[PDB]
Amino acid sequence: GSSGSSGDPPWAPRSYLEKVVAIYDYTKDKEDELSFQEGAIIYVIKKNDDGWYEGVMNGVTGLFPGNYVESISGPSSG
Numbered sequence: 659g660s661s662g663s664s665g666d667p668p669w670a671p672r673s674y675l676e677k678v679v680a681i682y683d684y685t686k687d688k689e690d691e692l693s694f695q696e697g698a699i700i701y702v703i704k705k706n707d708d709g710w711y712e713g714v715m716n717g718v719t720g721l722f723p724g725n726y727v728e729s730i731s732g733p734s735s736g
Contacts, residue, residue, distance in 0.1 A: 669717040692720025
């Protein structure tokens with residue numbers, strides 16, 4: 659529970675690791691993966707060994723490659 663503005667949707671997880679916003683179009687192949695478009699806030703919750711983190715999007719969860727996304731919240735100044 660951070661300190662500030664608390665505006666999150668019901669389909670979004672109350673708790674998560676960090677926040678990310680898709681920058682490129684990524685069409686999932688199987689339900690296992692996640693499909694999103696350039697401009698989707700994916701709440702990262704898990705991060706596999708390789709570039710693959712698990713997050714919830716529009717209620718639908720799925721694994722996506724940590725390449726078509728860009729970190730906007732974290733220790734990285736950007």
